[PDB]
Amino acid sequence: TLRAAVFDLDGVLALPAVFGVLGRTEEALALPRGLLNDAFQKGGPEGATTRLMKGEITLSQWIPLMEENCRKCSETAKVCLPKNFSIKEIFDKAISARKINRPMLQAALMLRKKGFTTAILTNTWLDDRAERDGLAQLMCELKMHFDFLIESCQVGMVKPEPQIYKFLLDTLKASPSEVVFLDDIGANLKPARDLGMVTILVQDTDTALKELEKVTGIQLLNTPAPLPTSCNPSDMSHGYVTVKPRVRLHFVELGSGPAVCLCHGFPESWYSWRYQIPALAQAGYRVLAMDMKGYGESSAPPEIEEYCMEVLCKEMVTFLDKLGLSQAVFIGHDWGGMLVWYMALFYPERVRAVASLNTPFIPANPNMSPLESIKANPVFDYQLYFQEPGVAEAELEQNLSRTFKSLFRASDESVLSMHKVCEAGGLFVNSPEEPSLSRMVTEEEIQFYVQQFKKSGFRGPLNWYRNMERNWKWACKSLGRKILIPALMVTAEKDFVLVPQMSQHMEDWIPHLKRGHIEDCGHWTQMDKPTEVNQILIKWLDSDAR
Amino acid sequence: TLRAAVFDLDGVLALPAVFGVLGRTEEALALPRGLLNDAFQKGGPEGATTRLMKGEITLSQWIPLMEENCRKCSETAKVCLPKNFSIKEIFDKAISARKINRPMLQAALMLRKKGFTTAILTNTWLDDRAERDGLAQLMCELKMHFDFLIESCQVGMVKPEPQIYKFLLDTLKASPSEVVFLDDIGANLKPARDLGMVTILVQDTDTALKELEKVTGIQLLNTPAPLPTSCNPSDMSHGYVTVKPRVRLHFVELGSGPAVCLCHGFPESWYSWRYQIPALAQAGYRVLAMDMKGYGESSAPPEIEEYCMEVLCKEMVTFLDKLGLSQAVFIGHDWGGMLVWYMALFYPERVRAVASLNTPFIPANPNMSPLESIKANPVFDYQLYFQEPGVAEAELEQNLSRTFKSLFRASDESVLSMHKVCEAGGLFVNSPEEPSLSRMVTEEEIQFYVQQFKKSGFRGPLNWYRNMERNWKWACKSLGRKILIPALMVTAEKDFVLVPQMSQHMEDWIPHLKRGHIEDCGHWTQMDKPTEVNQILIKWLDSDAR
Ligand SMILES: O=C(Nc1ccccc1)Nc1ccccc1
Ligand SMILES: O=C(Nc1ccccc1)Nc1ccccc1
Questions:
Q1: If one looks up domain B236-546 in CATH, what number appears?
Q2: Does the beta-carbon distance from B326 to A352 stay under 8 Å?
Q3: Which of A81, A55, A53, A78 is nearest to A68 (CA)?
Q4: CA distance A255 to B422
């Protein structure tokens, strides 16, 4: 019974194979067949390439040695190498051209999802080339998806020597018959088979995965489109910044590049961005996924005025100040989406670009009190229920698991009615005590929110709704302004609170506004359609945010 | 009795004045004198410029209005503007050319050091230009040095209206006669004087500072070279990363740009880099100042093997992995300097560039046991004293304030003798119970280290010395390698443990090695000569690390 899968890197998890460039170079340069592949392997176990692979020497120390073996090979074949002939140039573009074999990674990801232990076992080098970062990024993107990465150069052993196989088995704490091993080199597969491991000789991925699925008994080929990579909270880098005495802000941080500040809505978490954090970091950005004031590990002062938009925006500027950031791209959802428009209106020098999911930008009406505006829309009744301090807190805090299970539901899942909430007496009065689990969340993801909400409750969160008049007066000061920095409005077809239609007049105030639209998407945009959100955000970031 | 100083931005804290570009443009373009300065002020309090300054409209909305006022002005003067005439282009290079008036900032910094409340009061705009980040950075660099920044556009008031002055006094919680106010515009100085404030009309800085020093009674002109900006620990962004169960790493984080990982020595802190963190962040880098394993807020496991170089380096790689960083520039001092050379030998793909203060790179000797090598140098006797678990811990932990006061001393300050430590019975046996305070540290900076060392003590720190044989065997595996990535060796003339001479053969293993050398500098390089360290590091980072 198999319980472990081992993958080679070159020609297995990464394509095209760097080994296959020696033959391509021979054909392109009209050199004798195998001249380059022979100079690569010259001296066998005592040769330059083995020393490189065992970590005895670095890639740059090897470059001149390989060059020497190429001349000795050409001397015997009675040939000549081009005068442009450069080993560095050949391996530079070869390593650069090498990309993840996505179907192979998906099969490994599926095997790990089914309880398998996964490992990468590779014959690799210590790369000290000026261009090494490309390969460092590739290794980073791959390794995160596996239980173990065994590199020949770090363990001082190489395939096909049988010590690395015994090292692999000891790392896996597994008997050879419990292990599938995939390699593109027949010779490196031989000792794994001789020990009794299930072995697959990989040429094309499709045949390889058919063999892999037949042996494990798991469907890996033709499987549905998987979800983007999520976050495990304990594996994240956690940041804390004091913005004023007794007010600290928490954030999760991933990646390098321009700063991208993620701002959740009500009643959420930094964790609401779990599907966007790995994807945006991989896309070349420094992600700062906030716990907004009143939530999770951020401070939750009890005073209502601490949650007005002017105070919240000032604190986000101080947050940038304390982190030494002149700007950040601000991406908000729901209440966070509202804050991001106000960051762009009041602090344009600090905002590199602004993006909102579901929340439209609507200028304040100076001729109508915000409470008259709230009454003018029946879907906004729940906001009047939220006004009285302690009333919504008692209902929302009574049973936390029921709260998140009733709220976090997709469009198909008997979504919570928002009409006549005040008349009915509460938000969940016509709701089951034990609601079913939405297709959007696992039981574990629901418990994370339950755990987060145990620290401060719903007072701080509900206080974001208790400054309608304060926010209105502040917003009226910006009525002559236009948003002329890069901006993106993303609408969700089936959000019945923040309807796409509410955003139709935005171009009057944001003339250069760019749009995104998600079909069959409810209010919880990020977890409802993460693949589409990620696609729209990355496309907009690379074109308008840099 | 003065207790507050207020500075204008344009023509006071920042030079050249953006106002003075209208006249320079008139002279360059041969336009009538004051044509541009008149179109700028057209309509006075009801005009475009006032609306911009009150925050009613943004800089980009103002650009076309100013252009219109320029045509109306040229129409009356019976002239014509160039066909290349662009208000955006004029203000773009003007704002860009504007830099901090360093002598003025130094006087403000000195006034704040003498207990004065400092403030910036400026007539400014909401900048939404594509090039706004330049000014955002300038505002960031300046603001950090002041108690308050009052921008006209954020408060909806402008100088010379007397409401902003009454707003200034209320912010300062000060009577007009307790306040010095510096402005380059005579008109904006008038209401501050009329209220009874001490006022200075700034033309050239020198005359202005003579007036400023005569009135406060504080020497601001011809004063000695000040120290670089330091860090206040409570004002920092604090990061935490779990690298394995029960081992978490703490770091302080400041800036944006390429990642620069700072690695302290024994018995130190992230705080040992206090003078480098603001300077490197300002230089265009993302600083990660570590609490190395065993120190401060990082975990301190008790086992000796947890502190061997192989385990420490593996954890630093995991740290990069969890933060989503493919590479970082690694800068180490003392024991941190030793770790950085090993990060470069074993993980070159993860290290963008390597720099060491005082610690030389010396290949392991396979023909001599590390303990024989330690005995071969009398200055290394203290390391043998450090071997026995609990012995150095008891002495180092007995009185913490005495520990840091005896250790942290400059070359001129009766430095602790390192010879015959084992014979004498301890490190401080010939040392006073109450040592004097070194010129390098304040009493408060000593107490920060005392506080940090109260959590875990010296077991974890001393364990870095208890793996001599383990480290030696691991290092012997790298004897065939060369360091061929960017590298910098900084020697300290008066470090009598890590002497400059010990680094002389480095070019045999690091042929492209770059050097730095600090004269009259002891072991505690960073706090002894921070200005010189900062100068050497920034110069090397901008040329070799990017
Ligand atoms: O109240 C919500 N959004 C808010 C965003 C700012 C403007 C006004 C609307 N969402 C709420 C989330 C929980 C229940 C359903 C709607
Ligand atoms: O031991 C020290 N440095 C160490 C760095 C690694 C190689 C061997 C030397 N410094 C020590 C700091 C406190 C007392 C004086 C020296």
A1: 3.40.50.1820
A2: no
A3: A81
A4: 48
Q: Is B437 part of the contact surface with chain A (CB cutoff 8 Å)?
A: no
Residue of the nearest CA to atom 16 in ligand 1?
A497
Q: What single-letter amino acid sits at B439?
A: R
- CB-CB: which of A128, A346, A483 is closest to B348? A128
B200 - beta bridge partners? Answer: B182
Mutate to test the pocket of ligand 2, among B269, B387, B497 (most ligand atoms within 8 A of CB): B497
- Chain centroid, CA B6 distance in Å: 24
Dihedral sign (CA A352, A358, A364, A370) = negative
Query: Which B residues, 141 through 170, put their C-beta within 8 Å of a C-beta on chain A?
Result: 143-144, 154, 156
CA A224-A228-A232 angle, 5° bins: 125
**Rounded Cα–Cα distance for residues A375 and A260 (Å):** 36
- Closest Cβ–Cβ partner in B126, B253, B281 for A348: B126
Question: Could you give the CA distance from residue B469 to residue B94 in angstroms, rounded to a whole number?
Answer: 62
Number of other residues whose CB lies within 10 A of the CB of residue B353: 24
Say what the resolution is, in angstroms: 2.3
Instruction: Tell me which residue of B242, B347, B244, B312 sits closest to B463, measured CA to CA.
Output: B312
Closest residue in A to B56 (Cα) is A480
Tally of CA atoms within 13 A in the half-sphere of A152 that contains its CB:
23
State whether the beta carbon of B497 lies less than 6 angstroms from ligand 2. yes
Amino acid identity of residue B465, one-letter, is Y
- Please report how the helices B87-97 and B59-76 are oriented relative to each other, as an axis angle in degrees rounded to 10: 120
SS (H, E, C) B304-315: HHHHCHHHHHHH
Right CATH for B17-96 from 3.30.565.10, 1.10.10.10, 1.10.150.240, 3.40.50.300: 1.10.150.240
Q: Which residue of B has its CA nearest to A259?
A: B256
Active-site residue list of A: 334, 465, 523
Task: Residue B336: name the closest of B366, B371, B294, B303 by CA.
Answer: B294
Report the phi/psi class of residue A493: left, alpha or beta, with left for phi > 0 and alpha for psi in -120 to 50.
alpha
Kind plus residue range of the DSSP H or E element containing B73: helix B59-76
* Distance in Å, alpha carbon of A524 to nearest chain B alpha carbon: 26
Residue from B312, B176, B291 nearest B239 by CA: B291
User: What is the least distance, in Å, from the CA of A530 to any CA of chain B?
Assistant: 20
Q: Report the C-alpha gap between B319 and B10 in whole angstroms.
A: 44
Give the position of tokens 């383990």: B470
A359 Cβ below 6 A of ligand 1: yes
| Fold held by B1-16+97-217 | Rossmann fold (3.40.50)
SS3 B488: strand
Positions of B marked active-site:
334, 465, 523
Listed in order, strand segments (DSSP E) in B18-114 are 99-100
In this structure, what token pair is assigned to residue B79?
A: 């002239």
Q: Please answer whether residues A344 and A485 qualify as being in contact, where contact means their C-beta atoms are separated by less than 8 angstroms.
A: yes
Q: Is residue A221 helix, strand or coil?
A: coil
Asked if residue A356 lies in contact with residue A341, where contact means CB atoms within 8 angstroms, the answer is: yes
How far apart are alpha carbons A528 and A526 in whole angstroms?
A: 6
The enclosing H or E element of A7 equals: strand A4-7
**Running DSSP on this structure, what letter comes out for residue A18?**
G
Q: Do domains B1-16+97-217 and B236-546 have the same CATH topology?
A: yes
- Domain residues of chain B, as ranges? 1-16+97-217, 17-96, 236-546
Positive or negative, the CA dihedral B463, B466, B471, B473 is negative
With contact defined as beta carbons under 8 Å apart, do A280 and A537 qualify? yes
C-alpha distance from B250 to closest chain A C-alpha (Å): 10
d(CA B325, CA B253): 14
Cβ-defined contact of A61 to B484 (cutoff 8 Å): yes
Mutate which of B381, B384, B498 for ligand 2? The one with the most ligand atoms within 8 Å of its CB, which is: B498
